[PDB]
Amino acid sequence: SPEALLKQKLDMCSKKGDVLEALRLYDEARRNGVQLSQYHYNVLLYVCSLAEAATESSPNPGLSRGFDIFKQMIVDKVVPNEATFTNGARLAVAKDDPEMAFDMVKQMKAFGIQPRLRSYGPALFGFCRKGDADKAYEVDAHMVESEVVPEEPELAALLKVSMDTKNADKVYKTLQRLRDLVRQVSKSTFDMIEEWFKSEVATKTGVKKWDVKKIRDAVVSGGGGWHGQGWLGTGKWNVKRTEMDENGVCKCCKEKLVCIDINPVETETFAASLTRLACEREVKANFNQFQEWLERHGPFDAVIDGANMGLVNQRSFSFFQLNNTVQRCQQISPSKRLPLVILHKSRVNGGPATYPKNRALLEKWKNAGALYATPPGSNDDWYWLYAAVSCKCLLVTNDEMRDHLFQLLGNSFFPRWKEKHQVRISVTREDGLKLNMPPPYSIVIQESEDGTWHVPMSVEDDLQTSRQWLCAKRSK
Ligand SMILES: [Ca+2]
Ligand SMILES: [Ca+2]
Ligand SMILES: [Ca+2]
Ligand SMILES: [Ca+2]
Ligand SMILES: [Ca+2]
Ligand SMILES: [Zn+2]
């Protein structure tokens, strides 16, 4: 079979790295009238990726013909799958011609194909590296039109190019996008924002007087913690690295940060999504059985990730730590409700039930309507997440909630929900176990009604490391 033979020959051509032969075989298939499929085209795009950009001579056939091959695949109406977008992007990155990368995205659109975020990268980053703001803004407008949402690296590049070209309005808009989409910024974005506020352009941008009514109304309209009406005040910024105390008060200027509400409609949308996702991955009957059980139980003030409470910072499962956490949650519940403990059935009858009084206590919690033992093969994370979301209550876990399945939950609603609901344990020698409660304010870039900015840095563990903030306040 000829298409099956080209497959075999391109699979081999190449783990070897032979681009000149992959390009010979491509040309030969077309002289034989053998139709290249999705698989052939993808292998071919990957292999052309390995060509490198010629620093001395004019461009090599591998990269150069790679764009031709991509163009043809679309013309042929062969459907791109995830490997197509990845190899297409690798090729774009290797060539490092932002104009050619942007051409690839324009032709996807012309043929009704949805570009991916990684398709836009080599174009956007290419123009930003060249200081070409006008072209970077075109790419960004194109992304926005295709409903592709930028992440921090795209926003940071747009921020830097706006700073380089002295564009105060684009800086303002990008900073609002950082607030909306990212919330807390990486070290390098933080340093960038600090440079902005100390800069000459920042010093010289702003308004001495403004419609205070219009600001107040924008604050209500936006949901809280920003107004979006432009730079306010005049003159030099005082720009300090600082911290918030436990109540959200800036140690530099004493502004108390806002606690930003979550709209209950967004929460119900998210609960539906969460249920859909869990049922796609769990045995549906297992997850449904839990849903039905939960409808018949509670009320709950807290849901505990039992495996995480037994295991975090432990050489092996610690019933002491789980039980202490149960007792502590019950103590802080205004009506002394036991928390809902989610644990694997294998744990309810294995290592945590090793000692008879522990086993009797696990059974007592179950009999109090405060424990659900998830079935063999289940991923407990769906169960404790759904319970805390559904009961609108505290979620006790030290799980980071960022890898694997948690990526499916998105990077807007879920991080906001997590901040308001997640309780983590910490331990010290002097005191024992502590429950660390949600903050009374929102850890997000905030813009005050008078134009003052507070920008939080992102950190791995804000209980381990004290989170730094930037305070930017006009000196006059
Ligand atoms: Ca109960
Ligand atoms: Ca133990
Ligand atoms: Ca109550
Ligand atoms: Ca006892
Ligand atoms: Ca888990
Ligand atoms: Zn401040």
Helix (H) or strand (E) holding 414: helix 413-421
Instruction: Identify the CA nearest to 208 among candidates 240, 239, 235.
Output: 235
Domain containing residue 90: CATH number = 1.25.40.10
Cα–Cα distance measured from residue 343 to residue 317, given in angstroms and rounded to the nearest whole number: 12
Measured in Å, residue 360 CA sits from the centre of ligand 2 at 14
Measured in Å, residue 367 CA sits from the centre of ligand 1 at 10
Helix (H, G, I), strand (E, B) or coil at 165: coil
Place of tokens 């591998």: 62
Domain that holds residue 271: 262-437
Measured in Å, residue 398 CA sits from the centre of ligand 5 at 10
Measured in Å, residue 299 CA sits from the centre of ligand 3 at 8
Measured in Å, residue 388 CA sits from the centre of ligand 3 at 15
The resolution in Å comes to: 1.8
Tell me which ligand sits closest to the C-alpha of residue 469: 6
Query: 322 and 245: one domain?
Result: no
Cα–Cα distance measured from residue 303 to residue 296, given in angstroms and rounded to the nearest whole number: 16
Rg from Cα positions in the chain? 28
The answer to whether 410 and 402 are in contact (CB under 8 A) is no
Helix (H, G, I), strand (E, B) or coil at 371: strand
Query: 256 and 275: one domain?
Result: no
Instruction: Identify the CA nearest to 160 among candidates 194, 184, 123.
Output: 194
Tell me which ligand sits closest to the C-alpha of residue 361: 4
Query: 22 and 135: one domain?
Result: yes
Query: 85 and 126: one domain?
Result: yes
- DSSP of 275-310: HHHHHHHS-HHHHHHHHHHHHTS---SEEEEHHHHH
Query: 105 and 218: one domain?
Result: yes
**Do β-strands 302-305 and 340-344 pair in parallel, antiparallel, or remain unpaired?**
parallel
Cα–Cα distance measured from residue 274 to residue 218, given in angstroms and rounded to the nearest whole number: 32
Residues composing the chain: 476
48 is in an annotated binding site: no
Place of tokens 């340093």: 191
For ion ligand 6, residues whose CB falls within 5 Å: 250, 252-253, 255, 471
Instruction: Identify the CA nearest to 158 among candidates 120, 124, 192.
Output: 124
Query: 203 and 286: one domain?
Result: no
96 is in an annotated binding site: no
Helix (H, G, I), strand (E, B) or coil at 357: helix
Query: 476 and 367: one domain?
Result: no
Query: 210 and 274: one domain?
Result: no
Cα–Cα distance measured from residue 313 to residue 318, given in angstroms and rounded to the nearest whole number: 10
Instruction: Identify the CA nearest to 468 among candidates 184, 178, 198.
Output: 184
Cα–Cα distance measured from residue 97 to residue 102, given in angstroms and rounded to the nearest whole number: 9
Name the experiment that determined this structure: X-ray
Q: In what order do the strands lie in the sheet with 446-447?
A: 237-242, 469-474, 453-456, 446-447
Task: Provide the number of structural domains found in the chain.
Answer: 2
Query: 11 and 25: one domain?
Result: yes
Looking at 437, 452, 468, the residue that finishes a domain is 437
Query: 74 and 149: one domain?
Result: yes
Domain containing residue 396: CATH number = 3.40.50.11980
**Do β-strands 453-456 and 446-447 pair in parallel, antiparallel, or remain unpaired?**
antiparallel
Measured in Å, residue 369 CA sits from the centre of ligand 3 at 16
Tell me which ligand sits closest to the C-alpha of residue 337: 1
What are the residues whose beta carbons fall under 8 Å from the beta carbon of 242, sequence distance 6 or more? Answer: 250, 251, 252, 468, 469, 470, 471
Measured in Å, residue 318 CA sits from the centre of ligand 2 at 4
| DSSP label at residue 429 | T
The answer to whether 420 and 262 are in contact (CB under 8 A) is yes
Measured in Å, residue 357 CA sits from the centre of ligand 4 at 7
Instruction: Identify the CA nearest to 148 among candidates 59, 85, 72.
Output: 85
CA atoms within 13 A on the CB side of 444: 27
Tell me which ligand sits closest to the C-alpha of residue 299: 1
Q: Which residues of 241-252 are buried (b: 16+ CB within 10 A; e: fewer)?
A: eeebeeebebeb
Measured in Å, residue 203 CA sits from the centre of ligand 5 at 49
Cα–Cα distance measured from residue 476 to residue 471, given in angstroms and rounded to the nearest whole number: 15
Query: 18 and 164: one domain?
Result: yes
- State in Å, rounded, how far the first CA of the chain is from the last one: 79
Measured in Å, residue 371 CA sits from the centre of ligand 1 at 9
What are the residues whose beta carbons fall under 8 Å from the beta carbon of 303, sequence distance 6 or more? Answer: 339, 340, 342, 384, 387, 388, 391, 393, 394, 395, 396
Alpha-carbon separation of residue 341 from 303, 384, 447 (angstroms): 6, 8, 40
**Do β-strands 469-474 and 453-456 pair in parallel, antiparallel, or remain unpaired?**
antiparallel
Measured in Å, residue 167 CA sits from the centre of ligand 3 at 52
CA 146 to chain centre: 19
CB neighbour class for 6 (10 Å; exposed up to 12, middle 13-18, buried from 19): buried
Tell me which ligand sits closest to the C-alpha of residue 456: 6
Measured in Å, residue 418 CA sits from the centre of ligand 3 at 21
Measured in Å, residue 287 CA sits from the centre of ligand 1 at 20
253 is in an annotated binding site: yes
380 is in an annotated binding site: yes
Helix (H, G, I), strand (E, B) or coil at 185: strand
Tell me which ligand sits closest to the C-alpha of residue 360: 4
**Do β-strands 422-428 and 432-436 pair in parallel, antiparallel, or remain unpaired?**
antiparallel
Backbone angles phi, psi at 407, to 5 degrees: -65, -30
The answer to whether 59 and 53 are in contact (CB under 8 A) is yes
Query: 46 and 184: one domain?
Result: yes
Measured in Å, residue 396 CA sits from the centre of ligand 2 at 19
